[PDB]
């Protein structure tokens, strides 16, 4: 199987590996990329993987050690790809939520395709078709999402944690900011006051929770204002792995933004 660290990384892999091999995901639905430790079984999957796909040591730190033991030919380290490095944004150091950038997802698919052709020469024609089919579906999805989000450009909102910058930059969304950088370090009152002052003063439309975290501080901030409440899921928990799952993921996230931000 191809073993992907996070579900959306899995979505990209499953486009390319479709009809070739299985895709498995390490991080369970509900879990956070910022607060996880590998299970004994997670470890076994890694050693036995045909290919491991992950963002890199500044993202899934919980995977760095077991991945370091594998052949270079059996891993894609997304953040370290030559075509990805020029695309990194500071938004230290650089923001590592790379699976929300279509352009990086493209570079990821190319790397996956390239590695799997070497490892599985029996599936070269299928892998080639899968890559073509992935690019076509992604290009259509980018057109669709760009349209869905266009009216929303310029509306301020806050997100729970700093996960969305690549997507927001791509499609012209204009976040006022985020509650947390690391979503485990709960934000203090300081702070929650600064956010609500921004909300009112800058006339924000939305605040967004995330299903991986209890929404209390988000609801608290919105309380006594006209700001609407929504939810974004940077990990696509309700989407199943499969050929068109990455496109479905981007479309779902866009719909989650629009659901709250619509109605000017
Ligand atoms: Zn994150
Ligand atoms: Zn910040």
Swiss-Prot record:
Coiled coil: none
Swiss-Prot/TrEMBL GO biological process terms: cell adhesion; zinc ion import across plasma membrane; zinc ion transport
The keyword Ribosomal protein is annotated on this UniProt entry: no
InterPro entries: Bact_metal-bind_prot9, Lipoprotein_PsaA-like, ZnuA, ZnuA-like
Protein name listed in UniProt: High-affinity zinc uptake system protein ZnuA
Function per UniProt: Part of the ATP-binding cassette (ABC) transport system ZnuABC involved in zinc import. Binds zinc with high affinity and specificity and delivers it to the membrane permease for translocation into the cytoplasm.
Assigned protein family: Belongs to the bacterial solute-binding protein 9 family.
Protein keywords: Disulfide bond, Ion transport, Metal-binding, Periplasm, Signal, Transport, Zinc, Zinc transport
SUPFAM superfamilies registered for this protein in UniProt: Helical backbone' metal receptor
The encoding gene: znuA
Any one Gene Ontology cellular component term annotated for this protein: ATP-binding cassette (ABC) transporter complex, substrate-binding subunit-containing
Induction (record text): Maximally induced 30 minutes under zinc-limiting conditions, still induced in stationary phase.
Localisation: Periplasm
